[PDB]
């Protein structure tokens, strides 16, 4: 059922790319702040969380318009397929 196959595969691909960007940013920031604590040999729990929050908020301010474009496109498309037979 090429229609069910398409809609099902695209749902998962969209989950993977919508979620990837915030987690990539968070991971890279995490690594750099973890390193800096080693070369400084200076340690605390809170600095990485503090920076990660800002990094993710900026990520959302920037990309969020595109999240809307992608979701609207998919929303229309699935309805048209569901009611396509008539």
């Amino acid at each position: 059922m090429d229609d069910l196959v398409f809609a099902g595969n695209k749902a998962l691909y969209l989950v993977l790319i919508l979620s990837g960007w915030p987690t990539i940013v968070a991971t890279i920031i995490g690594l750099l702040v973890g390193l800096f604590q080693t070369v400084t040999q200076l340690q605390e729990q809170t600095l990485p969380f503090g920076i990660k929050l800002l990094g993710v908020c900026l990520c959302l301010f920037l990309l969020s318009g595109w999240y809307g474009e992608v979701l609207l496109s998919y929303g229309r498309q699935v309805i048209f397929l569901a009611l396509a037979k008539g």
């Binding site: 729990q45 969380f49 503090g50 929050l53």
Partner: protein, 223 residues
């Protein structure tokens, strides 16, 4: 009563009233908004649904009463008696226009026309139009076409209002959870603390007053 069929029609309408109220009146909106408020505050049981619905019905009464009264005063006049079918039919038709106006003010015409063309079997139910030509379609449209459009048009509006009402509380939730992570108290569920903050926030805004007033003001205007 002076006519057995007038009597029958009156009783039938009286029997259908609650479905008309539930499907063609601002009650549709007010009913939904209060339940969304309760959800956004995060309360399961309280206030009771019949408390909220009772208030919603009282408020809707003010908005709709002027039309009911106008129609009653119009129909109770025995000042003319009718020569023929068409004379009667037109006399009745012209009485509903106070309601027909109110539905046409708030529905969205593209649906109304779509349904009109659909209950007629015309041109196999849907066909293209080369030309776009508007024919005082406001007076043509049947009530049986207007009613669904109004219903959908107003449900959507309710969802919109509920969206706006959620945002302030979402802020509170994320803020509490972040300051708890700053303290490192990672095990503790925010809902134990965030709820009272929401309560006092709503109490200080006096959300019930603002909300109730604004709802009415969308339909009426008052000094």
């Amino acid at each position: 009563m002076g006519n057995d069929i007038s009597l029958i029609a009156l009783l039938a309408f009286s029997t259908l009233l609650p479905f008309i109220i539930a499907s063609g009146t601002c009650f549709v909106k007010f009913s939904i908004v209060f339940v969304m408020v309760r959800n956004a505050l995060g309360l399961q049981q309280i206030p009771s649904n019949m408390t909220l619905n009772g208030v919603a019905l009282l408020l809707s009464m003010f908005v709709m009463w002027p039309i009911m009264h106008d129609a009653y005063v119009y129909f109770e006049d025995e000042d003319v008696t009718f020569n023929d079918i068409s004379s009667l039919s037109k006399h009745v038709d012209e009485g509903l226009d106070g309601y027909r106006d109110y539905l046409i003010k708030y529905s969205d015409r593209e649906l109304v026309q779509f349904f009109e063309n659909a209950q007629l079997k015309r041109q196999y139910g849907e066909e293209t139009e080369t030309v776009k030509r508007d024919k005082d379609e406001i007076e043509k449209p049947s009530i049986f076409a207007l009613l669904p459009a109004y219903a959908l048009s107003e449900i959507k509006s309710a969802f919109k209002i509920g969206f706006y009402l959620y945002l302030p509380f979402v802020v509170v939730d994320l803020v509490v959870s972040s300051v708890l992570l700053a303290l490192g108290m990672m095990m503790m569920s925010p809902v134990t603390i965030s709820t009272p903050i929401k309560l006092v926030l709503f109490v200080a805004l006096d959300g019930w007053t603002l909300l109730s007033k604004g709802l009415i003001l969308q339909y009426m205007d008052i000094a």
